[PDB]
Amino acid sequence: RKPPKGMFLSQEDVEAVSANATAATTVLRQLDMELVSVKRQIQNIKQTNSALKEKLDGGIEPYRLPEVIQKCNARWTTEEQLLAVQAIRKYGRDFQAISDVIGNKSVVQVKNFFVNYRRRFNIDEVLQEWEAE
Amino acid sequence: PSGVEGAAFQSRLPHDRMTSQEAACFPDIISGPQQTQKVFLFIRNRTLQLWLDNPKIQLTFEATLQQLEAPYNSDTVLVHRVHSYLERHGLINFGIYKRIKPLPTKKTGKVIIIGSGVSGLAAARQLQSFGMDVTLLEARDRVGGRVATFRKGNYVADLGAMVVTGLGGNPMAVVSKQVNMELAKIKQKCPLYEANGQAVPKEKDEMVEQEFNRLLEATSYLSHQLDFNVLNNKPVSLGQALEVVIQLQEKHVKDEQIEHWKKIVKTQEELKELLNKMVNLKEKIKELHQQYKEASEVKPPRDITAEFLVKSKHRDLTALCKEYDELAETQGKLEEKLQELEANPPSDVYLSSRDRQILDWHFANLEFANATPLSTLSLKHWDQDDDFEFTGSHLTVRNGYSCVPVALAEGLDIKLNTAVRQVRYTASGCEVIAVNTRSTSQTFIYKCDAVLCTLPLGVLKQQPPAVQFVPPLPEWKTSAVQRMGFGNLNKVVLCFDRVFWDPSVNLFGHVGSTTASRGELFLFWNLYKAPILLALVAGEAAGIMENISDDVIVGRCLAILKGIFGSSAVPQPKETVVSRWRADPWARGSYSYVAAGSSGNDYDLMAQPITPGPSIPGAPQPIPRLFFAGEHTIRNYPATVHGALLSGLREAGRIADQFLGAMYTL
Ligand SMILES: CC(=N)C[C@@H](c1ccccc1)[C@]12Nc3cc(C)c(C)cc3N(C[C@H](O)[C@H](O)[C@H](O)COP(=O)(O)OP(=O)(O)OC[C@H]3O[C@@H](n4cnc5c(N)ncnc54)[C@H](O)[C@@H]3O)C1=NC(=O)NC2=O
């Protein structure tokens, strides 16, 4: 019903290796060259990646900023309201970004701000100008 | 098996079923009620048991009926019919036994048997037992034919048949009780030794053998499951198929490597795209940090836009730093996945040069068993006689196999040195024209009712013929002769003064240097009481080594043995003999094999008797005159002694039926 274990023999393969006098040597050479081809292709991309790794040396260490640890506040200082309006102008609806810019306002408080100070800070107009870019 | 059922097995018969032959002689019983069949079968099996329990004395009908019980001994004609059938076809009272009823005073019919090999001798004894006039014509100065035994002093070594291939259902088991045969079991273990002269480690000595067995199963799969049996009109050989299987196993090895390195490039190219994204991000982070720095240099107090810039760029920087860290995360995963794949590559090669040479020994061993290059064997049929193999350990005849034919030859009219030149067969009878081998001009004529031809297939193949048939053998017979394979294997007898090998090791291999010479002195036997080593020449090497003198052959033998046991532990041989079976004019080879383009059906064709045309036109259909026995005529047991023996028994039964009449069929 099926070939022995560790033995590989398909109807397709038999016909291909018995097609002529040296169809056996031909098929085995096409794979011998295919192997050499792929082997030197490996060292090539290995070389390319080795150079790209060296250009990443040091990582992003001299570019990391220390962690700002501030507690979330409920009241809006005029300052924070003004930061918010500018954050909307730059980020639109990315409430997470806006929250991070202000620093001491939670993502929900940011969404609340959108409805509370909606008319007073023409947030409709501010948002439509963000989309204009 | 044991009892009455074991006797059926020991006679190669199904204990609980009637054979085709039995159906022919007893058509009343087999077509009858099931109860009668079982009575028949028991009678048959019990009679066989009686003969088998004591094969040194004739088993008569009277003695048989005596030991039968009710309700089996009630029908005395049924018992007489069964006994007669078994005696006629040589299932009981065959070989060498003491006769209770001394042979009939006058004989009936005359048979000339060509050749006093085992097949010839077996028939001769039977026909004489049936009361026929029998004369055997042997070309050699000895009986046995391809059962040749070298004897000198105490050295005894078979140049021909050597092995009893298991006693389970072997007619030679019966013969071995009748003849003083010193049967010694063969220890299976065979240590190989490479060209260098050093053993193959059990590690490889199993990897190769298991691969060899796997390669055979694979050819069997190629034949039966993929129907790969004809290629370019030519029938596919075992060799061709083995080559194809090996090539596909080398192909798979490469296919595996290709798709493994193909896994590496796909992952390495994923890394390439990730490192590019990382370099471009570290670039933007570099610039963005500078911008944040410059925004922080603007010291307070600052307006809200300037304060926003600082905060905004701070957010943007940690956001891009979030990405780079998640990209360095992925880099670590891909970077170790590459050390994963590079750590475990697939197989480098299918078989190395060292491997392929040890495999070639296994191929040579198979070429030895079939006495022919694997490229000559039929893929579909080379092993058609596997199902009929005997049970039990293979044995050797320690006192020389010739003891068997010589024992059979006793009390028989044998003309030695008598080379048959022509066989003439007509509606009225036969004349055989032979000459004296010593002075070829001295001619003999033999007139007979029937001729039993036991000429080897090698002989029958000769072109131009060594034996002429008048009239010529029919096209269906000669085509079978041409189609069938007649192979070759040779032996080198090496007689020493001392044992320098492992005495508990029966056989040990020598691995050749090339595929071309794998057969050349590949195996050595240590079987005899005396210090004798026997060297085999198989495969393509057998035919070539025959053109080389004994000294050179013995030279190469010593060389090989030196490499294995030490250059000073191997002395000069006192006596040496080299067989040349293909050269031998009375053999022209060693034994038959199922050639590519042949089948087991050709063996049946070989066994078919020839019936001459009528003398006077319009005269009734003549009796068959020319019968064939021998190794190459028995489909289920070809190329063996027991096969030859059995074919003899077969023909003797057929001839006696023809010329003495079958009284038991009523
Ligand atoms: C399966 C096997 N392969 C069995 C063997 C085996 C091998 C490996 C592992 C285990 C066992 C195995 N080994 C083994 C080795 C070698 C080296 C050879 C050679 C053969 C065998 N065989 C096969 C058997 O040896 C083989 O099958 C039988 O012995 C053959 O018996 P006939 O059928 O009767 O043929 P023949 O004896 O020729 O009688 C014909 C006579 O006619 C004469 N004549 C000629 N011309 C004439 C003329 N013009 N006018 C007048 N006369 C003329 C001519 O001179 C001759 O006397 C073995 N048979 C076994 O049972 N066991 C063995 O071990």
- A41, closest residue in chain B (CA to CA): B265
Residues B529, B666 within the same domain: yes
Residues B318, B362 within the same domain: no
Looking at chain A from residue 110 to 129, which residues have their Cβ under 8 Å from any Cβ of chain B?
none
The answer to whether residues B43 and B78 touch, using CB atoms and an 8 Å cutoff, is: yes
Looking at chain A from residue 37 to 56, which residues have their Cβ under 8 Å from any Cβ of chain B?
38-39, 41-42, 45-46, 48-49, 52-53, 55-56
What residue owns the CA closest to ligand 1's atom 7?
A: B369
Residues B272, B213 within the same domain: no
Class of domain A1-133 as given by CATH: mainly alpha
Residues B536, B411 within the same domain: yes
Instruction: Give the C-alpha separation, B486 to B463, whole Å.
Output: 14
Residues B293, B345 within the same domain: yes
Which tokens hold the place of B377? 């064997």
Check CB contact under 8 Å for B311 and A68: no
Residues B216, B242 within the same domain: no
Alpha helices by DSSP H, listed for B566-640, are 601-607
Residues B146, B294 within the same domain: no
* Closest listed residue to residue B175, CA positions, set B338, B20, B406, B357: B406
Work out how many domains chain B is built from and give that number.
Answer: 3
Looking at chain B from residue 566 to 595, which residues have their Cβ under 8 Å from any Cβ of chain A?
none
Instruction: Give the C-alpha separation, B276 to B8, whole Å.
Output: 83
Instruction: Give the C-alpha separation, B520 to B538, whole Å.
Output: 6
Among B294, B322, B351, where does a domain finish? B351
Residues B341, B376 within the same domain: no
Residues B75, B47 within the same domain: yes
The answer to whether residues B366 and B288 touch, using CB atoms and an 8 Å cutoff, is: no
Q: What is the DSSP letter of A70?
A: -
Instruction: Give the C-alpha separation, B378 to B365, whole Å.
Output: 17
The answer to whether residues B291 and A72 touch, using CB atoms and an 8 Å cutoff, is: no
CA angle B205/B540/B224 to nearest 5° reads 70
Residues B556, B600 within the same domain: yes
CA B399 to chain centre: 25
* Closest listed residue to residue B659, CA positions, set B119, B114, B110: B110
3-state secondary structure of B60: coil
How close A28 gets to chain B, by Cα (Å)?
6
Check CB contact under 8 Å for B218 and A103: no
State the DSSP string of A71-111: ---SS--HHHHHHHHHHHHHHTT-HHHHHHHHSS--HHHHH
Instruction: Give the C-alpha separation, B193 to B523, whole Å.
Output: 10
Check CB contact under 8 Å for B315 and A83: no
Among B109, B128, B150, where does a domain finish? B109
CA angle B296/B301/A116 to nearest 5° reads 95
Ligand 1 neighbours by CB, cut-off 6 Å: B 114-120, 137-140, 145-147, 160-163, 165, 369, 419-420, 454-456, 459, 466-467, 489, 491, 581, 586-587, 590-591, 630-631, 639-644
Residues B378, B461 within the same domain: yes
Among B91, B109, B127, where does a domain finish? B109
Which tokens hold the place of B109? 């019919």
Residues B578, B461 within the same domain: yes
Instruction: Give the C-alpha separation, B208 to B362, whole Å.
Output: 9
Task: Assess A23–B contact: CB distance below 8 Å, yes or no.
Answer: no
What's the Rg (C-alpha) of chain B? 37
Instruction: Give the C-alpha separation, B392 to B67, whole Å.
Output: 30
Q: Is B313 left (phi over 0), alpha (psi -120 to 50) or beta?
A: alpha
Instruction: Give the C-alpha separation, B34 to A69, whole Å.
Output: 102
The answer to whether residues B579 and B590 touch, using CB atoms and an 8 Å cutoff, is: no
Task: Assess A1–B contact: CB distance below 8 Å, yes or no.
Answer: yes
CA angle B492/B640/B433 to nearest 5° reads 90
* Resolution in Å, one decimal place: 2.9
Check CB contact under 8 Å for B265 and A90: no
Range of the domain at B158: 110-235+352-666
